[PDB]
Design a protein around this ligand. Sequence first.
Ligand SMILES: *O[B@]1(*)=C2[C]=[C]C(F)=[C]C2=[C]O1
Ligand SMILES: *O[B@]1(*)=C2[C]=[C]C(F)=[C]C2=[C]O1
Ligand SMILES: *O[B@]1(*)=C2[C]=[C]C(F)=[C]C2=[C]O1
Ligand SMILES: *O[B@]1(*)=C2[C]=[C]C(F)=[C]C2=[C]O1
Ligand SMILES: *O[B@]1(*)=C2[C]=[C]C(F)=[C]C2=[C]O1
Ligand SMILES: *O[B@]1(*)=C2[C]=[C]C(F)=[C]C2=[C]O1
Ligand SMILES: *O[B@]1(*)=C2[C]=[C]C(F)=[C]C2=[C]O1
Ligand SMILES: *O[B@]1(*)=C2[C]=[C]C(F)=[C]C2=[C]O1
Ligand SMILES: *O[B@]1(*)=C2[C]=[C]C(F)=[C]C2=[C]O1
Ligand SMILES: *O[B@]1(*)=C2[C]=[C]C(F)=[C]C2=[C]O1
Lengths: 180, 181, 183, 183, 182, 183, 179, 181, 181, 179
Amino acid sequence: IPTVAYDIYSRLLKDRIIMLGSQIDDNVANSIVSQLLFLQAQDSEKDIYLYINSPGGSVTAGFAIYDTIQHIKPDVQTICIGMAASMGSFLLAAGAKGKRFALPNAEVMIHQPLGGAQGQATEIEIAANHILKTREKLNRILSERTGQSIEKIQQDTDRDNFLTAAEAKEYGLIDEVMEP
Amino acid sequence: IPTVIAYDIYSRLLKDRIIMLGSQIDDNVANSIVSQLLFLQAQDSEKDIYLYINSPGGSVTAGFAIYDTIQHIKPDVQTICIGMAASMGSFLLAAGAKGKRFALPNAEVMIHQPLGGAQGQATEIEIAANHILKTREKLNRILSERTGQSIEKIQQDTDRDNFLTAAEAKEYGLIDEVMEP
Amino acid sequence: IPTVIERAYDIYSRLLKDRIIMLGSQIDDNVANSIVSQLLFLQAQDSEKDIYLYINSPGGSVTAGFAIYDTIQHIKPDVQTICIGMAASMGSFLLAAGAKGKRFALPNAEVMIHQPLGGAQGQATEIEIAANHILKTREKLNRILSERTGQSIEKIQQDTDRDNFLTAAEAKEYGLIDEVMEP
Amino acid sequence: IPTVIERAYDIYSRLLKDRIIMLGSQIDDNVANSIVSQLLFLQAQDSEKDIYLYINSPGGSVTAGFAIYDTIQHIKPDVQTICIGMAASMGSFLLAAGAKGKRFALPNAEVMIHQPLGGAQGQATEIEIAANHILKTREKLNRILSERTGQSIEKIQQDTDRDNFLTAAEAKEYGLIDEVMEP
Amino acid sequence: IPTVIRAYDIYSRLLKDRIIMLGSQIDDNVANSIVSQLLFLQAQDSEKDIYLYINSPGGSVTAGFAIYDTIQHIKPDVQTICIGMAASMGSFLLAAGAKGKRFALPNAEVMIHQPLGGAQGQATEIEIAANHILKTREKLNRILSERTGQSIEKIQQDTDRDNFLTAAEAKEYGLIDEVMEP
Amino acid sequence: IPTVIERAYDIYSRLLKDRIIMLGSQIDDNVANSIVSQLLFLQAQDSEKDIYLYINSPGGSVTAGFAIYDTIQHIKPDVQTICIGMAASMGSFLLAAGAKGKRFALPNAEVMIHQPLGGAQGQATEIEIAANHILKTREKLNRILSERTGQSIEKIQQDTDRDNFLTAAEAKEYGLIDEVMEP
Amino acid sequence: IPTVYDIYSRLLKDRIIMLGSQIDDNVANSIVSQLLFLQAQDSEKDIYLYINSPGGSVTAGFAIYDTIQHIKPDVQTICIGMAASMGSFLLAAGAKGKRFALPNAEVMIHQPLGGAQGQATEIEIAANHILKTREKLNRILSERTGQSIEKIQQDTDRDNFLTAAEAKEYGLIDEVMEP
Amino acid sequence: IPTVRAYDIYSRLLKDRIIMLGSQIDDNVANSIVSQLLFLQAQDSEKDIYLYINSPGGSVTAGFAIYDTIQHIKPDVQTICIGMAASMGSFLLAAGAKGKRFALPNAEVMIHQPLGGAQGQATEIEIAANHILKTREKLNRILSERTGQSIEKIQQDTDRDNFLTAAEAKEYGLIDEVMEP
Amino acid sequence: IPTVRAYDIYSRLLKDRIIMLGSQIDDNVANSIVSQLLFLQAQDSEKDIYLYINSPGGSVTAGFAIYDTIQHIKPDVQTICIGMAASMGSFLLAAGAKGKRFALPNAEVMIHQPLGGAQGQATEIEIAANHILKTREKLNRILSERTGQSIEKIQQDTDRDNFLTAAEAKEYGLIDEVMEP
Amino acid sequence: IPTYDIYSRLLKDRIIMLGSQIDDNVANSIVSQLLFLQAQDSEKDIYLYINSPGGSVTAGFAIYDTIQHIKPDVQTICIGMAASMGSFLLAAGAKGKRFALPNAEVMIHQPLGGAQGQATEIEIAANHILKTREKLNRILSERTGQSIEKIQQDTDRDNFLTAAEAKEYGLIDEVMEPE
Ligand SMILES: *O[B@]1(*)=C2[C]=[C]C(F)=[C]C2=[C]O1
Ligand SMILES: *O[B@]1(*)=C2[C]=[C]C(F)=[C]C2=[C]O1
Ligand SMILES: *O[B@]1(*)=C2[C]=[C]C(F)=[C]C2=[C]O1
Ligand SMILES: *O[B@]1(*)=C2[C]=[C]C(F)=[C]C2=[C]O1
Ligand SMILES: *O[B@]1(*)=C2[C]=[C]C(F)=[C]C2=[C]O1
Ligand SMILES: *O[B@]1(*)=C2[C]=[C]C(F)=[C]C2=[C]O1
Ligand SMILES: *O[B@]1(*)=C2[C]=[C]C(F)=[C]C2=[C]O1
Ligand SMILES: *O[B@]1(*)=C2[C]=[C]C(F)=[C]C2=[C]O1
Ligand SMILES: *O[B@]1(*)=C2[C]=[C]C(F)=[C]C2=[C]O1
Ligand SMILES: *O[B@]1(*)=C2[C]=[C]C(F)=[C]C2=[C]O1
């Protein structure tokens, strides 16, 4: 809301800080991707800081952000404040290795995909196969980014799983709890 | 609606062993049809029963409650399609006693695959998908037995909604005769 | 809906004269009130002849289901249970509650077992009370299902974690019914 | 729902002929008016034979519940109370109100006790009047529950501060019922 | 709901014994039914008294006065018995029973208050509505004064805000004659 | 609602046997059709005995009210009118329409008189037609009220310009009724 | 609303942040961004956080709480009107010695609120989570007020409204600001 | 709405130390008014501030945020009622610097007791009742101090809604002067 | 809407001391009109101000905020009715500087009594009735002073909605002149 | 929409675009534009394009009286449709300078309105709308040269005119042919 003429977020973007503070939908992803591409074009070596306070959102919107982070040359540090849940915790784990952080009282939640399907049996089968493939894709990447096996990630996401920042570090979702 | 000298018109027909299925098939309709079938069997276990069907279909489990009761009881159940028998309605039409399944000449018969829905976690969507796929296999297997068509042909012919005339339904094996005037 | 000559009965009242009770809907307090009243009435008419309870039900209220369950176990007549269509959730619990040896399903009937569902809103303390209550309810259901099926409580817990759909033949193998009724 | 041969009764009317009243819903003014009328009718038919009140109820209006409570205490016949399913809130209050020695629950029935719920909107003065009224109502309920259970008022106050779910066996130990009815 | 052995519903069966059950809000339909039952019972026997059970949150003031005036008009005594709650026009009808024959059960509640209403429109119309509801309050207070023995000034003070009474307090107030014990 | 023994009447049918008609609602076409039919039926049963019309009504449709009014004036029996509760608008018009000397109100009944209400939308020409119609309707009502009360048309016009609430005693002084019925 | 900058941007130039609404993720995002911006402008000067808030999301509140504790400047907190629920938690989170309330401001403390629907297993997970959240809040309130965890648990079982003077006696603030 | 660099009309008045309170008082309005008061004090801690009030009232805690800020800052805050000051609006009118509280001649002032609501368990309703009763005592005590009336008189005079003319508000002590043309 | 640095059309007219009242009168509209009047007085306390009125009326207290501000400030406020001035709109039309109240020839002026509502206990309805009756007396007294008609005539003429042409409004004393082309 | 916005750019050339229903907001804007243009130059004429289904009669008369009051001629040009108060404003342009494009439509009709309440109030509303119709017909008679009786007959029901018929009727002076 406040102005500094920049709004406060535009002012932070000048210092290569991107604030992800909402549900992740296509509009949010389009804006975050555009900010990442802009920052890379301004300086391809300096790293970028992505703050995450997000309950999650669209899996495809989340993957648009995820792939852009992996594509660009700068390191993207990720910093969880408040909560990173679902695709939010997936993006937290996607930051540059060694540069994934959470503040001490931040929460991290991991779970399996949610969705819906209606229609003929054939269509329900297509939707089920699609969401199951999506879960396998997410688990495989989380395995690579955390060092946990795919079987452990599958077991640990069967139901909603809430982690403290310290537990998220032990799990491999972040590298450090940021102390004051 | 009307009363006859006192029965409503449907109660009067039930006295002559006629059951009128003229709506969507839900649990209340199935509970009533099953109860009428059991009552008629208890009144006379040898005389057959006449089930008129004008129905767009409805709940698959409600339809199977009626289907299994028809197969369970001793009397033959003749089935007579007037208007339309679609989805579980055409399944019940095909379930009548062999040789005693009829449609009137302008009645329509429609066959299709099951419809349903699922929401929730991936695991729950998978459970719902497996369930509706097993339900389709169960329906196709019975339709194969009652029509003489192979399961593969029934699967192909129900992939999309398939509307049949009474004459086509007879050629298909869903009914035995088109009832002429 | 239809009426039958005799005075006059609706079709369900006519079946009740032959000791048949039709459970063909979701189980709520009104349905349980009616089923319990029919069971008590039939016992008062004849305490030795058995009763036939047809079940086509997606389930419903757990406490309404237990009102029916306890009445079945309380009265002197045997209650045979016959699943047509579907017995899910408290419906499959009542199916398994019939007199041992007299629990049936028709060949294409479906049986579904699952864990309790519920909700809670309010202060942390209130959510804890609701969670403890629904967890105790699940343990109570599993313990009775274990007794009526012969499966261990641990197996019932594993098999109800997610919705579990059984064919009539599988329900017999599981111990939820005694026989698949053939034509 | 079903009808019974005799002329013709619905199932509840048939049970009422045997002095059985079925309370199987939320308690509102219409339900209380019907239950009170049935109690007065049964007393007028025979002032000595007792009456059987089955309770499966989540509770409801406190004043409707007290209409039933006071009628039970007023009439000459004993009123046995039998909990099936659940007796919660004013339902458990009416369960505890049955004739001493004749209050029962089936083994898997649940009993829940709690404090009154209500609401108030308006000027500070009006909110104060509503608060005083609901606090007096709670004291009235606790005092009667103390008399009918033998627990002290202080224990009832502590045990109803939050929703308190009891098994039938716990309800007997508490003094809300006299016996768990076994098969 | 239930039927009794031709065939009566439970309320019709009680009406045969001269019992009328007022168990709802008082609107024009309820008043029309209660008035009709009172006239019917008087026509059946003009000497035997009538029993009016009251469990009511109140309702329309004019519907309540239709019942009130019919009670005062007919020859039989009308006993009134509060169970549960008699609030607003319900407590007014409770106090209207035959003197000496107004009762409440021990845990019944009685609530008295001033009239409620609404008005919208021109200043002139709001004034007409205000004058009407103020005259209605004076009419109610005057009758309550006569039936309870309290002064009009005390009734006015005691109804300014909602006033909840126990059965024992309602007896002390003069709204009923006796708390009915078991 | 209640039924009375004899065959079987609802309470209103039982009163109609004694030539009592109960007008206890808003006056719409369905109510007027029923009241007119009852008046014609009672005249056909006995053309000399009078009829008793109880009125507790907020009013309603002017044309439905005139259907009742003209039927009262047409038939041979006297129709006594008795206001209980409230007779407002077309209700007070029908109260004043009873047989002269046989129009009553109970002591706390209220009588309200006012001018017609209505609405109109559309072209100027259509609004003019609707205005002329409702003004003619008011003149028709005032002329009849003048005849039945003995007040001049000018006084009735002044006294109905705004809603005018009368006590039973004031309604008698006005000429809308003949007597306040005392106990 | 008014321009001078809008009025809030003008106050932010003097290191004043105005928290005047329910605390949701958007509000927390903005407050955190303002705190980081002010630290980057000057890491030594303190910051003034005015609080008039009925509370809101617990995780949004902790985003603000952890940012306050993380940055180098002291954050003074000043309650005007009401600080309830996570609002009173943030009031108590200000730099020790620099937590204030105006004399007629109200402070309310309570336990977490939430909801859960679904299978028994899911309700259990939600109950365990909200109970752990309450323990986390109580432990921090104990540290910031000097009251024991058992006293905070007892005093938050039901909604507990405090005057500014009572909030000072409790340890939620350091001083009632007089005129 | 209109513009007068560029200011909207309210921003232009704020440059002359005029704050316009012309709506219900909620948390957003209080946040803005408090911010304007702090800004004006920072610009000049000696010149007084003019607060125009046309408000039906609103949140009691939002009103106290404004009230305490007025009492806290160094400048005098003159208050000027135009139209209506009701409920927390009349409380803020009475809160202006003593001698500098005004109403225009046809402005209305209304005083009343707090309004609120509560739902839930008896214990929770009791907590809400105690809270709103303490809030009323706090308001009455301050109104007593600012008007010179006793707390008992304020309690009696706010039991029901009490509408005052500007002249009556001056006689009551809620304002110091009726502003004449 | 249109722009003319850069002003919207209303801001451009305000530079020439013209205020356009073209809507229902609520608290937001009154707050804006009052602010414009105070701003114009501060710019020049001698030049008069032109208030165009096309308004169906609105809140009585919002209308009195504008009325009292007009009477308070030093400049004359000319009032010019275009289209319609009804209810508080016609009250503000009559409030312009004497000799400087105008209507265009086909403009309409409507006068009536206050409208309002009340719900609740008898005591509360009485308080609301007394308040709206006092409000009507206040309006009638001022209209009497500004038109030269007696209070009794204004009371009779506002009992029902009373529509006046511009020429009739001049004869009545609500305006001084019909503005001719 | 496009960028001055396009309408502000046309207003610089003394063109006002009336392209919507006529309500109080539209009339206030059109009146303000007319007064502004007169103040800029009291001799040059003004061009008012009209594509409007009509709207409020009093809002329409605010525009009508302002047109007649100001010194510049106001040319009126109908494109698309001028119906009800729209056709009234079309006929109100400077005599000789009222135009329609060849496929534009002009519709004339009687006033529409509504009334609810007591008989006395319905009578007041009926008298008011009948006086409004007489006022409109009298002005249309003056601006078209048709008698009041003919205008009354021709507006009893909705009456749709082509541009050529509107010229023959006297509502416009010329059908504008292509350039
Ligand atoms: O939560 B989370 C989610 C949701 C949905 C999807 F699809 C996916 C995912 C991951 O995380
Ligand atoms: O149509 B139809 C159907 C539907 C659903 C299901 F589930 C199944 C079926 C068969 O047919
Ligand atoms: O499904 B099912 C259910 C539901 C709910 C509860 F609580 C329980 C149960 C069992 O089954
Ligand atoms: O739950 B329960 C209840 C509710 C409400 C009231 F008031 C009371 C009570 C008791 O229980
Ligand atoms: O409550 B209650 C009431 C209401 C309303 C009116 F008018 C009256 C009364 C009495 O009581
Ligand atoms: O009220 B009332 C009325 C209404 C309407 C019309 F038309 C008429 C009348 C008479 O009364
Ligand atoms: O109020 B408050 C709250 C709410 C919710 C949660 F979760 C937490 C908390 C603290 O405070
Ligand atoms: O009105 B007013 C008010 C409301 C609410 C609260 F809480 C308070 C107050 C004061 O004024
Ligand atoms: O219209 B108008 C009006 C309305 C309302 C009020 F209060 C007032 C007035 C005057 O004018
Ligand atoms: O259309 B049009 C119109 C409408 C309405 C009014 F009032 C008027 C007019 C003319 O045209």
